[PDB]
């Protein structure tokens, strides 16, 4: 009669005694309890969302502006010879949302100077995604759509396709400062979206600056390159051999 009465003291005793081998330290987890240290993206994930409600005060409004500049312009410095004061004032009374102010910054000449002129168009699309959306591009469907939209409808419509998009509507919306969110699994992505955001993001200290030795070359078209247009590699090989043998 193992335990007729209510008290379970033997079962609990043996359960506790056997739980000891279950909590033994595993193989190792020094760099594994945070794989973000391998990603080197701890700060971006632990940087909470910054918002601007309707009744907001002076405090953190400067903080909201600092977060906006640090996101939109990368870690690249922005001298107050470049900060648009009129846009900030238009934001202060809520005449424009944070989305509208970000549209303004995207259409300033500082944003263009940094990301549009010294760069190609692939790099421009990658940076537009990484800054105004938080994620890397997924495939050349996005690149082709955005490049055609640029050449056909101007930089204005090109940036609007990022700002007034559906994705920007849910994930950030009117009053949320964009954050790097491709590190966490975002629904409906390729496994290369995370890899692309990891490749674009070199660290908390680094930035995607125009004024460096490399001249701000593309980081990801090499990464995004193979899957889209290298399915026809095998037959193109026979075509190239046939051309060579002539």
């Amino acid at each position: 009669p193992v335990a007729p009465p209510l008290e379970f003291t033997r079962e609990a005793e043996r359960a506790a005694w056997l739980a000891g081998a279950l909590t033994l330290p595993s193989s190792l987890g020094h760099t594994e309890t945070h794989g973000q240290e391998r990603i080197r993206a701890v700060g971006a994930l632990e940087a909470a969302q910054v918002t601007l409600r309707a009744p907001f005060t002076e405090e953190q409004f400067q903080g909201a502006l600092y977060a906006i500049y640090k996101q939109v312009f990368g870690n690249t410095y922005v001298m107050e010879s470049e900060r648009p004061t009129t846009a900030e004032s238009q934001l202060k009374d809520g005449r424009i949302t944070v989305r509208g102010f970000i549209r303004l910054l995207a259409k300033t000449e500082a944003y263009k100077s940094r990301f549009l002129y010294t760069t190609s168009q692939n790099r421009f699309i990658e940076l537009n995604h990484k800054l105004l959306l938080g994620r890397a591009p997924y495939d050349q469907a996005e690149i082709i759509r955005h490049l055609d939209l640029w050449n056909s409808q101007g930089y204005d419509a090109e940036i609007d396709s990022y700002i007034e998009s559906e994705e920007y509507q849910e994930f950030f919306g009117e009053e949320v400062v964009p954050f790097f969110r491709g590190f966490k699994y975002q629904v409906g992505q390729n496994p290369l979206g995370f890899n692309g955001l990891v490749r674009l993001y070199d660290g908390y200290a680094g930035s995607d600056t125009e004024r460096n030795q490399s001249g701000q070359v593309a980081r990801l078209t090499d990464r995004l390159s193979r899957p889209v247009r290298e399915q026809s590699s095998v037959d193109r090989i026979e075509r190239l051999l046939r051309s060579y043998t002539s």
Binding site: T51, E164, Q169, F172
Partner: protein, 69 residues
């Protein structure tokens, strides 16, 4: 927006009554919960897509006025 069509921004009044609230329930809350009614301004060049978008979300408008002319 360089030409005359670009200017004359309009002021749009938007309400997010239950017809949109049910769609937000089925989709989820990913931006902080906000009041149903407010007042918004949209440029003419972007008036069509923005209003298609707000109808897509399910929000219903009250009326629109002209800030210029």
């Amino acid at each position: 927006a360089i030409t005359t069509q670009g200017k004359r921004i309009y002021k749009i009044t938007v309400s997010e009554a239950g017809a949109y609230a049910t769609n937000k329930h089925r989709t989820g809350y990913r931006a902080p919960i906000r009041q149903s009614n407010y007042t918004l301004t949209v440029p003419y060049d972007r008036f069509l897509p923005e209003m298609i978008r707000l109808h897509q979300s399910g929000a219903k408008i009250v009326n629109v006025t002209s800030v210029i002319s």
